[PDB]
Amino acid sequence: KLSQDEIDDLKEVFELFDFWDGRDGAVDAFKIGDVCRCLGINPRNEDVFAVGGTHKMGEKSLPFEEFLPAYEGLMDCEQGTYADYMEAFKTFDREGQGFISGAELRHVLSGLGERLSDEEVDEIINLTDLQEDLEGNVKYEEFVKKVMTGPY
């Protein structure tokens, strides 16, 4: 299954993260998720735990060859679609016009699911350049599209 071009990429990224926790030919299991994120997949935390991901730094370290099978195990994780996302946000939409309040937006992002931190919420809202109007409302469709299309 795994393309040789893909295995190359994983090595590039594995090496970077190896460097960042102290270059030894090993990546902390705590960073499995982020390595995979850098490779362009979007695993849930539960997904990465399932593959041996840990809950804090310094419990376990993986050499590349224990890492490859994790990345392969994560490549088939369910990834959300635009339609799932619209359906999700529409359950919070009080009048079905496509607006949600910024406070509500923060509630779903930081109060539900795999809760994000305030910093991460602040950051995504900043990076996506999402504005509220004078009544503090946002168009979630814009936000969803921007998050999906990514930083570049």
Binding site: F19, W20, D21, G22, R23
Partner: protein
């Protein structure tokens, strides 16, 4: 792995200035001459000992052999300042002391306890701020 051309050109320039003879060799007279132009001039035994570090007569090729490994992966003041600048987003020109300590000791090619100690013994640090611009001047100078 190296060494870059600019470094070669520098070394040649250095060698050229120390060889007051234009002889193509550095000897003890060249050395005394150069040191005396810069300040204190070390005693003849220090000088002879410096010359002894070279297997033979101090040609430029011998000069190279004496410096190449030790200068191998060194970078300009500028390059190093920009290296530091990459951890200084707001361009304060300082780094939180704890931050540079963490980077140096726990990441990359980790510094051991002795490297850390000698690194910071004389480092410019004040109010928890590590002055990397000043630090870079220091590691290039004296």
């Amino acid at each position: 792995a190296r060494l870059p051309q600019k470094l070669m050109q520098e070394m040649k320039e250095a060698f050229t200035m120390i060889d007051q003879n234009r002889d193509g060799f550095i000897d003890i007279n060249d050395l005394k001459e150069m040191f005396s132009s810069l300040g204190r001039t070390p005693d003849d035994k220090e000088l002879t000992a410096m010359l002894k570090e070279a297997p033979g007569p101090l040609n430029f090729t011998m000069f190279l052999s004496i410096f190449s490994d030790k200068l191998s992966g060194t970078d300009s003041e500028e390059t190093i300042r920009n290296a530091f600048g990459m951890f200084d987003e707001l361009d304060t020109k300082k780094l939180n002391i704890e931050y540079i300590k963490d980077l140096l000791e726990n990441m990359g090619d980790n510094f051991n306890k002795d490297e850390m100690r000698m690194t910071f013994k004389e480092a410019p640090v004040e109010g928890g701020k590590f002055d990397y611009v000043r630090f870079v001047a220091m590691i290039k100078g004296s």
